[PDB]
Amino acid sequence: DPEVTLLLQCPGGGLPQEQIQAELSPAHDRRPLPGGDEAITAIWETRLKAQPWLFDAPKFRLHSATLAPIGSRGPQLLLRLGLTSYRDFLGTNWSSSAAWLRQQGATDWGDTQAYLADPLGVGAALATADDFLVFLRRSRQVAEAPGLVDVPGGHPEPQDLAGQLVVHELFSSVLQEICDEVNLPLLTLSQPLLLGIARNETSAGRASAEFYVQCSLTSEQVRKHYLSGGPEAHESTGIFFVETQNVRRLPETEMWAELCPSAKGAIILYNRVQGSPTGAALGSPALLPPL
Ligand SMILES: CC(=O)Nc1ccc(C#N)cc1
């Protein structure tokens, strides 16, 4: 799977909100492009002159994420974040020249990402009461990853002493994206756990935070809520469910080639952090069948 890299695997089966610190600093921003940010402005003008209904939006930028020594007391993760935008993403990560910007950043800053917007995404491994995970089919008419399988998620928009409000917005945003696209009541969802962070090498290394969320509804009830919105209530074109039993070997299935990179990251991290038991009971052969 060369199109996804793991940046972070969380300990303890995943981290809750109260164990994460954020540092939001202009030191964590993208560096100005070598020949100037006029190249980003030119791409944006070309795009608005064809699609004048498009609008910019601010985004969080991932600089890095440092885990505490395992088994320690106190905060377990530090997220180093800056600010970016949907315009800066289109002019850098989405540019045909994105590989040239990665080489230049290695040369100039010793950092392949230094000249890239790198907006932070969020995604969820969303489990039902009857032990399935939730998948969504992407429209074949989008420009990115057309027709591929996704999980619920999105790219959160801004508004430890500004830090704790930023961590709150990240955790809130993954629940809001489930409510908006799957049409589930907020009170049927658990507080999220952070499983880790995955990078999309097909989009010049931009990262997504991947979370585990439990729903109190069955697969049949989730399907009814999604469909009862009608075609205008969702961006996806369909919903479907895979037993958690069968997610373990998903990389060996024909479904794997249809999954977009950020969804592959969610499933790899679900399998390593929520699956993969360490104790004698769940590790016994009848409960963890060999192969
Ligand atoms: C939703 C989608 O198709 N992809 C996407 C959208 C916005 C950003 C940003 N900024 C990055 C990727």
UniProtKB/Swiss-Prot annotation:
Residues that bind Mg(2+): 177, 181
Cofactor names: Mg(2+)
Residue span, Nudix hydrolase domain: 117-273
Region (Disordered): 147-159
GO molecular function: GDP-mannose hydrolase activity; metal ion binding; UDP-sugar diphosphatase activity
Coiled-coil segments on the chain, per record: none
A GO CC annotation given for this chain: nucleoplasm
Name of the protein this chain belongs to: Uridine diphosphate glucose pyrophosphatase NUDT22
Catalytic activities: UDP-sugar + H2O = UMP + alpha-D-aldose 1-phosphate
Family: Belongs to the Nudix hydrolase family.
UniProt keyword list: Hydrolase, Magnesium, Metal-binding
Enzyme class: hydrolase
Entry EC number(s): 3.6.1.45
